[PDB]
Every structure is written in structure tokens, then in C-alpha cells.
Design a protein around this ligand. Structure first.
Ligand SMILES: Nc1nc(O)c2c(n1)NC[C@H](CNc1ccc(C(=O)N[C@@H](CCC(=O)N[C@@H](CCC(=O)O)C(=O)O)C(=O)O)cc1)N2C=O
Ligand SMILES: Cc1ncc(COP(=O)(O)O)c(CNCC(=O)O)c1O
Ligand SMILES: Cc1ncc(COP(=O)(O)O)c(CNCC(=O)O)c1O
Ligand SMILES: Cc1ncc(COP(=O)(O)O)c(CNCC(=O)O)c1O
Ligand SMILES: Cc1ncc(COP(=O)(O)O)c(CNCC(=O)O)c1O
Lengths: 472, 472, 472, 472
């Protein structure tokens, strides 16, 4: 005989699965008692999380609102229509000129569907090279020729790079490359580029070689919504994004695409209109995905409502101000930030002049409750032992930190990188040797203690710190 | 000035976003006051949903446990390790012989990653034709030559079919086709095939043509874990699955793959071992996906713990018994079931002897709170007006229904299709004619009420019905 | 110092290069002192050979007549124009309905250009399976899955097969395969198919699945021109051919293509016209080839004039009558011919009932100055050790042989195969054993001498036997 | 009844086809009464033409010597073995370190076969851009993105370019491109590059990106054999060539490839040997070609014997000296030669400083019995109305012309380009206007008369002028 429904189906997680409950509680503590500096991370709201964790997960709704492959979607259709309208509203787009698909499971699924919509297999793409700051899905293959992203396997990639001495995109070399290589699609936006984008120039290059132009604004989408960085929609045909980075929503993707009359082009027929909508929609489903994750879509609708608030614009300005204040602190100590600063939410920090790799700094930081990620920098031949570390402001800004707080974060990072170098100098560069300095290191314990003291001063979205299992 | 953290970040959904709150509440009522017969749907536990809606959503954790691209993953690593271990445990797999990747965002991402791991672009694949019961992602292009799934775009697909008379897989024709086409990969498992699979014969065919053999058990994975249907692991190299269908977990995908020594095969060196693990992991990340959805992985860990329990085996047994009891009832009313019954959780109902298409039935059912999906059957060209309806037992079985209750479901469907016919007979076969009959039809309203009365008799997992915003 | 022009440039081959001169004389004797039965070989005229060895070899003439990439093509243009017009005249084609490109270097270049003109890489093609009698370039990969022809590498091939009972094309299986596989191009015509083609049925199949229909008439092109076999032009979009087989010209290829209004088709604009010409021309040059071989084109113009003569119709009738007479003679001795006879210039002889493979027969025959080729038959998994031999009538018919002479050839082959049996019986079935019977075998020497005595009874085109260097 | 063999088969071309005979005679007069300056043309020997027009055309010989798919190849095998050995001897190659395939039908088939041997579809290649001097088959697509050569369709091409100011290959930019694009194959050699090649630098670049290195020596093959330009064999993996340009043979191609021990490289095993042979042979047949053209192979063996003689080295020296003397003359008149001279057999003449396109010079020259070809120059978008004209020395040097004779050719060209200018000034630049200036032009008739008088002074290889039909 079956269990009663209530026993398996209505009993709380803390009773059904104490192990997973306990680990989530440990993760909750970790999230609010360290300094979380991964530039792609945020702390989303409790309201988002309540939508995310809901009966919306139970629904199959393949297709489009009002034209589904399954019955029962009366309310799912309203949620998805609301999410789409809030997505357009959040970025101040007119529905006559822009549509959006909110079904991508994540950012990488959003980009692959966008590419599948407008490209045939082996069509040519160019995006920012990963060590220059571009994303995996922008066509990444290594300088040794190893195809890493499937966007370099199913499509033909030729990346463009930053200037090797300034760290800024070399728009002249971008243009010359696009004219030689003749891409069908040029991708802009990136994962570790600390400056804004001259989308107008990208449009000029795309028009000179007849390419489509797509912006992936995943990292800065919240800053775009808040009108705090350049808008890609003014110049790009398609804009993809994640929703969980600076937009501060659930993990999901969106694809924005132009609709309606095309701008005037020579030879182009009169009355020409954009043709993205049906192809984008079809590429997401049925080409690539299956059932939408409606709990993500519902949670995303919440997040887009929250991103369209006056409070969110001030958040986005604070993120930029915090990144700049951090950047100034680090550069004052002599740390090598790419481009010597930032115009967005992140800094990219070249550790090679110190004789360090990013994995060592990431590991030492981790032991002090400082959460970063190692990161490739220009000319790197390793991702797991790269020459850089990347620091972002969104997550801690979401806990309310301001510029002086991010100067203190800079001080903690200076202490952490100093300690990293000291350990390497005393114990050596090999990881087996370096790891010996990570044990019973009083300076690690001091820095960890200072970090948690600091972290505990601030509020925390998403859950009630007062109610967590693991207390101070 | 920024908003206080608590206002945007800790306030409940019901206050932050009353529209989305209200829409979720309406969907909760719909789920527990209708008859939910989509074969791919289930009702998952509250405990799963609590892990799904949690701070795990905030974490970036690309890579493998213990070897990540980001700091801060000490607990996320334990959660993913626990999830992988429980996945092996739930299917009684020896870790020396099988591994599993639990990062796929959903079923379609799991399949595309499995394909990408073992196939080059344009390599040949054979799966069950969609009108014969196979899935979109098994290489679906239409009988008109339209490439629908991206599996038929990036790879070269040729489907195998069921016998056009019996509805069973024609294993002789499968073999002839495999030796002609010479696929690199043969896929078994399906979405609407009401019978079990002779995996041993699939292995014999794969071995004769030199193909890899992959089973997609998405639909029956819960039945497989409970050992209530044939096990694909006995004969398949790779097993993909979703976790939200009969497995009753969150929406996610899993890829199982063989490890360790290869079985004796002539022309193969001694001491040869499987090489799937690294290709599978790399295909999931960094080839295709980005950050894992750790809230999904934690929720999946809960579901896998729930699936290994003795109560789950009783559940899987009951799902099968309910499907059989419903099939016997419908056949007793003279309806046409593909293969004349079922061996799993679903029945496939051919409506063409009745002069109906499944969109008519799905819509009529929908206005009566009977949630089904139209379904292609053999020879169909239209997906949006196909010849069949698919009915599955997992979701209502999870509410505690047994065989006599599924006989009542059978009578409700019999009433539903009878009324669909009368609407057609009275108003017309052209959809615009037929749709006249769906306006203030007292017989629809009566059937809808009766369905609600029946549904209200049963418990409901995932949320407390006594607590929902909308009652009677 | 520069040699004087006359010493290197005007001295006859016999003086400049006695080795090659001598080898050519040895080959000349071989050609008129053996029985030459390779079905794709012919003996072309001295007039063709005089054009072939001419100053036309010196000219670069890329492009089209009157629109070349080089100067000096006044006369090359008239030659190519004359060749094209003669090609249309030889097949009784209306220039308003058919065009022809005569630049392909050989048959395989002609086919690859035709495919390149109308297909993208990886588009699907269906041709007759090589063991069923199809050609390499029709998409050959082996029953072991090895891609042999580039047509199966750059395109996606799936062959259709003969019925194993009758040896004829199975047209219902062809249709079913075409409807399953959905080729963009269906190829008909073959290399070892001894029967005619139902081009009308091929057209019905191609129309049903939306495919282009190409006939490769290389082997029977001379019989087509003489209206002695079915005309592919009645039903095919494109007809490719070599010119050195039954057409009895130089080695070259030709692509014929439809021009002008398309036939009425529901699902086709009015006034729709064929669009092959420019694609076919462009695929030949500049896509694939370089400079035309103008000596070949001149020689081809000669051959096309000869093919359009009353004597050539009598020759084509004789080729067919000789093939039938040979087939009946062999079949009267108890041998197995695929399909039980022939309707064209060749017979396909299945040696497996005798316990023989074609290499053994081919090698024994070769030692006896009987020139055949081993040939795959239905079921074969080896090309260098296949189960059949192919025999053709064009070359010996061109020396003037008539039916009674081909009955004598039949008796020579009967002696050859009988001796092959006796060697195998005496020495063994393994090749290392069998080859011991080929050394100092008086019976081979006797058969060789009898073959030469018979062969010397007949005239010989292309050169004068009375003037060859190596006399009897 | 059939015609007698003698009537159709042994009768001379003059009787069988007076039309083709007459047209060939007209071409013969044109070849020895004008100035033939197409850099890719030559006048081959009578001995070559006698082998070309021989019974060798009748033989099918698919396969390799001693391992054929047909009987009867005793003498064809000896001819092909001899050709290959003479090919290695002509280029001073040790058979232990180099092999050659002499079956390619022409230059473009040779290159496509070499590519097919070592590349998969869509693998990356880099060749000299066509306007910079590279060949079509080196991956040519236009600056507008139109794929012209199939080598840019079946493979992924990114050309390298000359320095726009100097006309010389920019080896630094080649290296940067190669490191960014990561080609599998780098091609060197070209069609209109007037300088020698730094094969060492190409090898350094190929090694830095892990590419194969192929040289297409078609144009300068004869200069390479005579050791009068740099040898590509010192540094290249594969060397392809035509045989009809400076090598002065029939129209055919060859593919040379390394054999035996590989050069030392860390990571490469000891005892590593090259593996090109089987792949190259297989790519030629059975992958791409069908039956070898044995008359071309036999003719090629003759040409290779002639090329290995002492007079040929003097010929190759004279070719280079004549091209230089011609170049100096044109520059002395103020004309603009790409790179301001030549190190090989050709000059590339930029007409754009004159306000002329090459088609006008080609047409006017053609009316004056001066055979040139228009040629793309750097930055050209048009090939039929390009910016340049290309002049080569091989053909007229073969008639015995020396430097003073090529200075008169320079004067004839000066007169011709002067005349082209006068006509364009008088009648206009639109083709319809310019062409009317080509009628009743006394300066054209005077220059034509002078050209014929000059041309009649010289001997002529390949046929006896004293014997032609159209005497002067
Ligand atoms: N119907 C029909 N269609 C045609 O197109 C033709 C025809 N008849 N007759 C004449 C001619 C045959 N041309 C062919 C036919 C097939 C193949 C072909 O399949 N070649 C593979 C296998 C070769 C093989 O058999 N190897 C041994 C082992 C010993 C060893 O490999 O040395 C083994 O595997 O047993 C390879 O090269 O790998 C190559 C050339 N031809 C067109 O020209
Ligand atoms: C066999 C099979 N495989 C994969 C999937 C894809 O799962 P996602 O939707 O998570 O991408 C499905 C979904 N089938 C849904 C249905 O049959 O209604 C499936 O049936
Ligand atoms: C520009 C960009 N685009 C797309 C993605 C993909 O999102 P998913 O991980 O959801 O697939 C990322 C993730 N970048 C993660 C990081 O920069 O740390 C990104 O930076
Ligand atoms: C470098 C090069 N390679 C290959 C070829 C092709 O040869 P075929 O034409 O035989 O295919 C050419 C011909 N180039 C002709 C010219 O430069 O005028 C060539 O110049
Ligand atoms: C039908 C067919 N098509 C094309 C070709 C190719 O012709 P080339 O060899 O000129 O490339 C052949 C050659 N078949 C050779 C044989 O049957 O013996 C052929 O049989």
C-alpha cells in the first residue's frame, strides 16, 4: 500500500530530508557571514524565492501563451504574458519594436537558442575572446585551438580581442577582422570586460560586413534596466541576458528581439519588417528546449517588477559606485586592474605581476570567507590556474553596502592577496607546497574572523538571518 | 538612497507581487480541483519545493565538486555529491560501473549534452519516430521534411517506427534500418509508447551495426527505479532522464553513463574501459551549459531520497495498475488504444475512429478541468491537431487514487469524448463551427462541476489545500 | 643554352621518349589481341584521338564562350559551342528545354559539380547501392559504414537497393526510403545494373518527396543517344554522363540540365522557370574546376558528331544484341546472371554459386588476355574480393563483333571460369594456395594463345593494326 | 548492319570531322602568329601531344599500379610507375622521403584531393587571397562574402594578404591570423604573385599553430624542377602542382607528399613516420576521381623526362630573364608593376593608375593578336573588370624568345595600352562606348600586323608550322 499523501508529500524538508535541510542552512549562513564578490552572483529576494519554490514546477506548458501543446495552462499563460510584458517594461521597450522570449532555462540556453534562430550550423560568429572578457558561449576556443564551448563546435568562431596594453576593445582590429572573416553574427557583451560598449560602433561594423548584431548583457542587465550603462537596444538586433546577475532575479534567460519595420538600407525592399520573432520562438521550442520551467518564469516576473522600481535604480547606481570605489582602493595599492578601473559592476585584476595565479587567491580567500573567482586575463593558457581574479559589487551591494564598505572590502582583498603571496614565498609555488601554508595560519584566522564580523553588520535578502539554524 | 533590505528583499511574495501571488494561488487550486492526466506531469512533494525555493539559487558553481571555477562552494559541493550518490542509489547502480551527471537543466538539455559528448556534428542517430511514440529530441523531423528538433539539425536523424497495425516497435525493421543507415547512436525510450522496451534486442542491433545505445527513460524513470519496468542500464551505454515525470522530482535532467571495464567483444583490446565520463561531463559544462541550478540539484537530491523509499515502490506499482485499469475501462467503452493497452504509466488513445482530432478533445477536456494533451499517433502530420490523446496515471496516483478511481477517470473521459462528439455532431467539424459548441454549454459546465466534486475528494502533495487562497 | 625548338618541341615521341613510345605500343597490341570486356571501356576512333592529341591542350579558357577570363579564345569558343550544340543534337534535345555543360574533366567531376550546383554540404542524396549496381559517386559508403566516396562525406547518402529475388530495383522500397529519409536529390543510373530504368516511377517518387531527380547515364549514354534504351531526359531534372563508355568518345563528362518553363505543379507559381543553368555552370567553374581541357572538348565534339550518325544507331543495337547473346550463352552453361539477362550493354555474373570470388576470375582471365573486372553483387562486403564479375559488350562490338562472336567470347569465359575452378580445386580456396596454380600453367598459356588467335581476326579502331610496332 | 570499322574508326579527323579539323587548324595558326602571354599557358612538345592523343585513352585503370580494380593494366602500370619515378627525379626527391600521385585530372582536382586527404569538411584553411595573388582553390571568397571556390564551401577559409603598399606577403600578419584562426592547413604558392616564397617562414608559422603546410607550385613548377626558384619541398608537407604551365607538359595535376621519418618535435613519439601516402592516394581514388586519364599520365611521363634535361634548366633560366627584361621595360615606360618587378615567370601589371580596367586591355590586345588575361589586383572587387593584367614568359620563351625579344613584347604592350587609352579617351569608358572604338581602328590593324610579322619570326613546338592548313 502507498504512503499517505501527507507523509511524503506535505511534510517539511527539515523532516523529509534533514541532510539537505542542514546543508541549505549551512549555505545560508555562508551567504550572510562572508563577503560574496563573484561578479555574476546576487542575493535575490524572498518574494522571488517564494515564486521559484512553488507548484508552478508541476506544469507542462510547451508552446506559447494561448497556443500550447498541453491543456490546463489558463493561469500559466497569464504568468508568462505578465513576465514578458514586465520584461519589456523593465527595459523601457515598446512592444511594437521589441518582443521577448522568457523561456530560456539559463543564459547559455538563451544564447544557443538565439544562435540557432538566426544561424545555420557552421555559420560564422565573432564575439569577445574569453581572456579578453567574453563569455564561453561567444564562440570560445583556446589559443591552443581546443574547442571549449559548443558555440565553437556547431558554429565557426573567430573572436575579437582587447588591446594587449590598454585592455580596451580594439575596435579597429574588430572591424578589420569582421571584414576579413565575414561573420553572420557579431556578439557584444561579456563576462569580465570592465568597461562599457560602443554599441554604435558595433552597429557600424555589423552594417559594413552585413552581419546581425547581438548583445549579451547578462552581467549588466540590471544596470541596463536602470539606464546606468549604455543601452544595447539602440543598436543591436537581438539582446540576450540572464536574469540572476545584476538583474537580481532567478536563474533564467531572456531573448529580446526587434519587431516591426527595418531601418532604411540600400537594396533592402521597402516595407521590410524584422523576421526574428517566429525564428527565436521556434528555436527555444520546439528546436532546443522542452517544457518551460514555469516556477522560473513566475519568479522572473517578480524580479522584473522589482527591477522596475525607483529603489532598483538607486541600487544600480550604488553597484557602479561601489565597483569604482573598490577599483580605486586596489589600484592605490598597486594592483593591476585591467583598463585601470571600471565602468560597470566588476573589476578584473591581473595577479601575474605579483607572480601569483588566480586559483591560489581564490582558495586563500575562500578560507577567509571571501568568495571570489579566479579568472582568465589576456594571454592566459589556463582557466583553472589563470592569471587573474574577478571581483563584483552586485551581491554585497544588495546587502546595503556603500562605498566606504567596499573600501573595507578592498582592504580585506589586499590582506588576502598579501597573505597569498606570503604563503607562496614561504612554502613555494607548487600547490602541494602552497597548501601547507593554508593550515594553522594565524593570519588566515584573523582575516576570516574580521570578515565575518564585518559581514554580520549587514542585512540579508532572501531569508531571515534571525531565523537560520546556524547562529553566531 | 537605496531601499532597506527588508522591504524589497525579505517581504513575502503576497505583498511584493500580489498579481503573481494570486496567479500561483489560482494554479494551486486548478492543480487540486481538476483531473490532471498529462502523462509527463506529476505533483512533487513540499520538501522538494522547499529545496527548490531556497538560497541555493544564489550560487555560481561551474565545474565539478571539489574542482570548481568559483570559490564558496563547500556546501554546494556536498549537495551535488549527495545528489549524484542518491541518483545511483535510487537505480541500484554500482558506482564502479556507472556514473551520473546531475547538472542538466532539464530533459532536452540532458539529451543534447549526451549527444554532444559522443557525437560530432552531423553524426547519425536513430530514435523512435515521434508519431510512433518517440520524443522531439530523438531526432524529430516531420514526414514533410521539416526539421523540428535541433537534434535533426546538428545531427543526422532517421527514425524507426512501430508496426502500423499492432503499434509495437518493429524490431526487425529497426535492425534493417540500422544496418542501412549505420547510426553512430541509437536512442530508445519515448514519450508516448505504451509498452516496455526490449533493451536486450536494442543492444543486439547496436552491436551488429556498431552503434552506441542510449535510453531516454524520462517518462518511466520512477518505474525503472522501483524496478517495475525493464531496466535500460542492463544493456544501454548511456541513460538520460528527466526528474519531474514519474520520478516525481523537480524539473531537471540527469545523464547516467557506464564506467569501468568494457564487456568482452571481439576486435576490442583487453583491459579496455569505458570513456564516457569525461566526455559527458565536458559536454554538460563547459560545452553547453553555464552555472548549474543548485536549487534544482538540492531539490533533486530530496526527490531521489524520496524515490528510494519503500513507499515509492508501492507508488510505482500503483501507477502501473491505475494505467492498466484506465485502459481496460476505455477499451470496454469501445475506444481505440494503441497496442490495446499499456505496460507503463500511460495510454495512447487513437481518436480517428471517432472522427475527432485531439485538439478538440484537449480543449473540451480543458474547459471541464480535465487536463490532457492532444498527441500525435502513427501517420499524423499535424501536431496541433493530431489524431490522438495521451493520458497518464502518475499525477493523480500521487494524490492517492487507486484503480477504481481511475475507472472513474475513465468514465469522466468517456463523458468528455461523448460531449466532444455531440458538439461536433451539432455544430460542425470545421474548428470555427465546432467552437460554437463550446460557448455557454450547460453540459460542459455540468461535467466541469462533477470533475471538481470528484477531484476534491483527494489529498494533494506540494502544498496544503486547507491553506490555499481559493476554496469553494 | 636553350635547345633549339625543333629538337625538344617537334621531334616525334618515338625519338624523344622511346620508353613511353614502346609502352604505348605494348598497350596498343594488348588492346587488339585480347578480349576486352570491361563494360565501361570502349575503343574510340582515330579522329577523336587526333583531336585529343592536339594544340588545343595549350589554351586556358576559363569561363563561357564569349565571356572568358583569358584572351585568345576565338576558336576555342567555336569548338566549345560546337561541342555543346552537338551534345544536344546527339540526344535529340530542344535547346529551349535543355542545356549542357561540356567542361567536366570526367564522370566523377561531372557528378560532383552537379551535386555542388543543387546541394549544400550534408544535404541528403539517394542513389543505387553499389552492390545493387550503383556507382561510387552516387553516395557509396560500405555495409561496414566506411565512407568511401566523397559523395558520402560532403553529402549525406542513403542508398536504395535491388530486390534480392529479382535483382531489379525495388521501386516500392525506393519510395518508402525516400519518404523516410527525405533526400534533396535522388540519383538514378548505375554502373552494373543490367536492366533499364523506370524513370517515370523515379519522377513520381521524387515528386512525392520533393526531391530533384538526376540520372547518371554514363554507361548507357551511347544507347540513350541511339534511342535504344529509355530516355532519362523525359523525367529527370539533370542528366550527367561520361563520354568514353558506350558513347565511344574521349574521357570527359557532360551535365545536361532542364531550362525554361517548369511543368505545372500545385504548389508552384505560374510562369515558373528552371533555375539550373547558372548553378550548374558556376559549380563547374569557378567553384570546382579550373581551365577546361580543350583537347577533350574538341575530341568530344568529334565523338558527338560520330554518335549522331546512322551507323552509330546500328552499333548501339549491336551492343545490346551482343550482350544478350553472351548472356544467353553463359546462362545456357548454367551460370547465374543478376536479373537473369540484360537490357543494356552489360551482364552482371554472380560467381558465388560456383564457390568463386571475382578477383580469382578476373586474375585468371587477365593472365589469358581476357579483360574483365571483378564486381560487387548484392550482399557483397568486399570490393577487391567480391562475388561477381561484370562483362560488357561495347569495346568488342566496336571491333565489329556480332552475336556469334559474342557466343565465342562466352565460350572463352566458360573455359576461363572452368580453369579457375580447376586451379581452386587443385590448389585451394585461399589466395596464397590458389595463386600457386597460376605459375607455369600450360592450360592458362593455351587459353591465352587461343584468345589471341581469336582476337586477331577482327578490325580495330583508333590505330592501324597493320602499322603497330608489335606484330603477331 | 554496322559501318566498317575503318570508315568511322581509322579515318583521319580531316575527313571524319572537317569542321573540328578546321577549327583546330585555325587555333594552330593563332598560337604561332600572335604573342601568347598568358602566364599559365605554355606550348608543349609534339612528343607530349603524341602520347596525349593515343590509345591510352581507352584504358580503365582505377586503383594503384599492381593493385587495380580492372584487368589488363600490365602496361598502364608500367607507364604510371615510370611517370611517378620521373616525377620524383624531375624534382630531385628521394623516394624514401617523398611520394607522388600522378592521377589528378588537373590542378584544381589535385588541390581538392590533397585537402580531402588531410581535412574533414569545415576544417580551417588559410591561403593567399586571390587579389593578393592566390588561386581560386586556395579558399577564395570575395570581400563581399560570396563563396566563389568550393574550397570555401566544403572547408572554412581565411585568406592571408600581401602588404597593400609593397605587394609582398605580410608574413607578420599571416602569423597573427594563423594564431587567431588556428588553421589545420596553410597553403602557399599562387597564381599572380611575382615574387618567391619564404617557405621557411611558412614552416615556422605552421609549426607555431600546429598546421599542415601545403605549397601549390602550379605556376612555377618548371622553375622549381630546374632549381631556379626556392624549393617548397624543403619545408612543406605536401606539394601540389599542375603540369601544363612552366613545367610544359599536358594538363594534369600531381600531389607530392612526405614519406618516412618525421622531423623531431617534443611530444611526438620516436619512430614517428608520415602518414600522408595512403590518405592522399585514397582521396584521389576512390574518394574523388574515377578512372585515371592514362593518356595524360603517359604524356606527363614524357614531359617529366623533358623537364629533367639540361636544356630545360636553360629554358627556365631564360623564362626568368625574359620576365625580368619585360618587367624592366614596362617600368621604364612608367607602368606600375606589383612589387616593382618579378622573381619568377610573370609580371602583375596594375592598370588602375591609368584609369583602365584589365578587360579593356585584354580585349584590345586580343584584337592585336596579343593574348593576355585581365587579372585581379589588391583591393579588386571585380574579376571580369579587374584592375590589372597579368603577363607571363613561359609560352613565348618556349618558341625561343630571349630578352631582346621580350623587350619588343614590352613595346608591343606599351603600344597596346597606349591604344586602349586613346580609345577610352575618344569613345568613353562604358563598355558599349569603348567597343565602338574597336572598329575600323587603323592603329589596331597596324599593331596587329606588326605582332604577326614579329610572331612569324620564331619556331613553334608541338606542330609543324610549315605543315599547317592556314599559311601566311
Ligand atoms: N556497381 C559498381 N559500381 C561502381 O562504382 C564500380 C563497379 N561496379 N565496378 C568497377 C568499379 C569498382 N570501383 C570500386 C568499388 C568499390 C570500392 C571500395 O569499396 N573500396 C574500399 C574497400 C576495398 C576492399 O575491398 N578491400 C578489401 C581488403 C584488401 C584491401 O583493401 O587492399 C576488403 O575490404 O575485403 C576501400 O578502398 O577501402 C572501390 C572501387 N566501379 C566504378 O569505378
Ligand atoms: C522521453 C523524453 N525525453 C526528454 C523530454 C524532455 O524533458 P524537458 O521537457 O525537461 O526538456 C521529454 C519531455 N516530454 C514531455 C511530454 O512527453 O509531454 C520526454 O518525454
Ligand atoms: C555574458 C554572459 N552570458 C551568459 C552567461 C550564461 O549564464 P548561465 O551560467 O546561466 O548559462 C554568462 C554566465 N557567466 C558566469 C560568470 O561570468 O561567472 C555570462 O557572463
Ligand atoms: C596556383 C594554381 N593552382 C592550381 C591551378 C589550377 O589548375 P587547373 O586550371 O588545371 O585546374 C592554377 C590555375 N591557374 C590558372 C591561371 O593562373 O591562369 C593555379 O594558378
Ligand atoms: C555511372 C557512372 N558514373 C560516373 C562514372 C565515373 O566516370 P569517371 O571514371 O570518368 O570519373 C562511372 C565510372 N564507372 C567505371 C566503371 O564502371 O568501370 C560510372 O559507371
Amino acid at each position: 500500500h502507498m504512503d499517505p499523501v501527507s507523509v511524503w508529500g506535505n511534510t517539511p524538508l527539515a523532516t523529509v530530508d534533514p541532510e539537505i535541510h542542514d546543508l541549505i542552512e549551512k549555505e545560508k549562513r555562508r551567504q550572510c557571514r562572508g563577503i560574496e564578490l563573484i561578479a555574476s552572483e546576487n542575493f535575490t529576494s524572498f518574494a522571488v524565492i517564494e515564486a521559484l519554490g512553488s507548484a508552478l514546477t508541476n506544469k507542462y506548458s510547451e508552446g506559447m501563451p494561448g497556443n500550447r501543446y498541453y491543456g490546463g495552462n489558463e493561469y500559466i499563460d497569464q504568468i508568462e504574458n505578465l513576465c514578458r510584458s514586465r520584461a519589456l517594461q523593465a527595459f523601457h521597450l515598446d512592444a511594437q519594436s521589441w518582443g521577448v522570449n522568457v523561456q530560456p532555462y539559463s543564459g547559455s540556453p538563451a544564447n544557443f537558442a538565439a544562435y540557432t534562430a538566426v544561424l545555420n550550423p557552421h555559420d560564422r560568429i565573432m564575439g569577445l575572446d574569453l581572456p579578453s572578457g567574453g563569455h564561453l558561449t561567444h564562440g570560445y576556443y583556446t589559443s591552443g585551438g581546443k574547442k571549449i564551448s559548443a558555440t565553437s563546435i556547431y558554429f565557426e568562431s573567430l573572436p575579437y580581442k582587447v588591446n594587449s596594453t590598454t585592455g580596451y576593445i580594439d575596435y579597429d582590429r574588430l572591424e578589420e577582422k569582421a571584414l576579413d572573416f565575414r561573420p553572420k553574427l557579431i556578439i557584444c557583451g561579456g563576462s569580465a570586460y570592465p568597461r562599457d560598449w560602443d554599441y554604435k560602433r558595433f552597429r557600424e561594423v555589423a552594417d559594413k560586413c552585413g552581419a546581425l548584431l547581438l548583445c549579451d548583457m547578462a552581467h549588466t542587465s540590471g544596470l541596463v534596466a536602470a539606464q546606468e550603462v549604455n543601452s544595447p537596444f539602440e543598436y543591436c538586433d537581438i539582446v540576450t541576458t540572464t536574469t540572476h546577475k545584476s538583474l537580481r532575479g532567478p536563474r533564467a534567460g531572456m531573448i529580446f528581439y526587434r519587431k516591426g519595420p527595418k531601418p532604411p538600407k540600400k537594396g533592402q525592399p521597402e516595407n521590410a519588417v524584422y523576421d526574428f520573432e517566429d525564428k527565436i520562438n521556434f528555436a527555444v521550442f520546439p528546436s532546443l528546449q522542452g517544457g518551460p520551467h514555469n516556477h522560473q518564469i513566475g519568479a522572473l516576473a517578480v524580479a522584473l517588477k522589482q527591477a522596475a522600481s525607483p529603489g532598483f535604480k538607486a541600487y544600480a547606481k550604488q553597484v557602479k559606485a561601489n565597483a569604482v570605489a573598490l577599483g580605486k582602493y586596489l589600484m592605490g595599492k598597486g594592483y593591476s586592474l585591467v583598463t585601470g578601473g571600471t565602468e560597470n559592476h566588476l573589476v578584473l585584476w591581473d595577479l601575474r605581476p605579483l607572480g601569483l595565479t588566480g586559483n591560489k587567491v581564490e582558495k586563500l580567500c575562500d578560507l577567509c570567507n571571501i568568495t571570489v573567482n579566479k579568472n582568465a586575463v589576456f594571454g592566459d593558457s589556463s582557466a583553472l590556474a589563470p592569471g587573474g581574479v574577478r571581483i563584483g559589487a552586485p551581491a554585497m551591494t544588495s546587502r546595503g553596502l556603500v562605498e566606504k564598505d567596499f573600501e573595507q572590502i578592498g582592504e580585506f582583498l589586499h590582506r588576502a592577496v598579501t597573505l597569498t603571496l606570503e604563503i607562496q614565498k614561504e612554502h613555494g609555488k607548487l600547490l602541494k607546497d602552497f597548501n601547507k601554508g593554508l593550515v594553522n595560519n594565524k593570519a588566515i584566522e584573523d582575516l576570516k574572523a574580521d570578515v565575518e564580523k564585518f559581514s554580520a553588520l549587514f542585512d540579508m535578502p532572501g531569508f531571515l538571518v534571525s531565523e537560520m539554524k546556524y547562529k553566531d
